[PDB]
Structure 1
């Protein structure tokens, strides 16, 4: 089985994310659990938590179908240690909100070296950040998202993901999410079925499908290897529709949230329906 949805809005409360997912016939969804703009969000209230759980139950979203995204302001590889510590505190808080909400996955971009430390040192800082969060929480898997590699962002090579995982002690609670736009922008081609297989064999040799915990299904406005992150609606960008059909027909992508972050929410229900029909 595949679980297919979108990163929907949590405006008016977290439970509305589940409602919005059901209104586009999603079988998965992503959301932010707080505003992306504060190192301290107010505590989740017992009512927010219960409304969210009640809506997930009403619309049949189990923990395995939901892929929250952390704030884009967190940098778990920050070269400045006081900033690193603020990002680690924020990340622990995000993981704890997932605990409270009954969520079992948390997707995040790994971090950025800001030209102040080496790639290896940054990746090690990121692995330690994950270890710290996993020591302070239970039941939530840290899902590392690949990136386009814009600026000093890491995680654009599959080897970066593997290097982080190698440094994580509790391998049972780390995994990865592959965003197709980010992969393409980083230089992993997806424009033909043969190129898709080549890219995913690379992923298999370097990371392995045992760590795959989510996908983000995005076409790309940016160009191949551009290292720019600009999504597009399915079929309208530089990747094209074939990659998405290929993914939908491959059983290695079963049982995990497959999340659109495409740029026109007015057509999400149609994109979800098209993806389901490609199976």
Structure 2
């Protein structure tokens, strides 16, 4: 069993997301529990929480099929203590918000040294940031997403994820989410079944599939090793459809939210359908 969806919109309320997900026949969906470009959001009201749950229950979307993503503003590895504290508070908020909504996963970006600390220093801060949050919450698993490696942003090498995990105490609540566009941009080839098997065997060796808690199926507008984060619709980009079919036929990707973040939402229904047809 595979859960295929997209990062649908939460405009007008979290329940709408589940509704939007159902409208395109998704068996999985991602969302923002609050605007990802602002520091503060009004606390969830029991009304919003209830409606969201009613919506999810109506369509049978279980916690294992939902992959909320945190704020863009958060840097769990910020070189400046004050800004790091702020990022930490926010991240804690996002995780507490997931607990209220009965969501067990939280997709977030690793962090950036902003040319002001070393890589180790930045990674250890991320580890610390996670321990701190898993310490102030329950039931929510921190899912680290690999990145394209733009600017001073870490997490483009599988080794960064493995190092961040080594520093986490409660390994039961830490995981990873692989974004095809990001891995490709980082330098992990996927343009053929052969490369996919190779790129994922590597992932298996340095991180291990027991930590995979989600996927981001994006094609790339950016190029191999460009370390540029620019997505594209499935098959219209530099990666191609082969990789996505390959993924759909590999059982190592079962029981997790496979989320589309392709550039044209209007064709998400077709993309979701095509992906399913690949199994």
Query: Per the shorter chain, which TM-score range?
Result: over 0.9
Partners of 2:33 and 2:64 lie apart in 1 by 16
Asked if 2 retains the 8 angstrom alpha-carbon contact of 1:39 and 1:86, the reply is no
Q: Quote the offset at 1:41 in angstroms.
A: 1.6
Name the residue aligned to 1:243.
Answer: 243
Partners of 1:139 and 1:234 lie apart in 2 by 33
Partners of 2:37 and 2:93 lie apart in 1 by 13
Cα displacement string for residues 1-54 of structure 1 (whole angstroms, at most 9, x for unaligned residues): 000000000011000000000000000000000012333221100000000000
The answer for unaligned runs of 5 or more in structure 2 is: none
- The alignment's TM-score, normalised by the length of structure 1, stands at 1.00
Partners of 1:25 and 1:45 lie apart in 2 by 28
Q: CA RMSD in A?
A: 0.5
Partners of 2:39 and 2:181 lie apart in 1 by 28
Q: How does 1:1-279 map to 2 (within 5 A)?
A: 1-279=1-279
Secondary structure of the residue aligned to 2:258 is strand
Cα displacement string for residues 208-237 of structure 1 (whole angstroms, at most 9, x for unaligned residues): 000000000000000000000000000000
Partners of 1:190 and 1:235 lie apart in 2 by 12
Asked if 2 retains the 8 angstrom alpha-carbon contact of 1:156 and 1:183, the reply is yes
Q: Quote the offset at 1:151 in angstroms.
A: 0.5
Secondary structure of the residue aligned to 2:69 is coil
Secondary structure of the residue aligned to 2:60 is coil
Partners of 1:3 and 1:39 lie apart in 2 by 31
Partners of 2:39 and 2:21 lie apart in 1 by 28
* Moved >2 Å (runs of 4+): 37-40
Partners of 2:40 and 2:23 lie apart in 1 by 31
Secondary structure of the residue aligned to 2:225 is coil
Q: State the number of aligned residues.
A: 279
Cα displacement string for residues 73-95 of structure 1 (whole angstroms, at most 9, x for unaligned residues): 10000000000000000000000
Partners of 2:220 and 2:40 lie apart in 1 by 33
- The alignment's TM-score, normalised by the length of structure 2, stands at 1.00
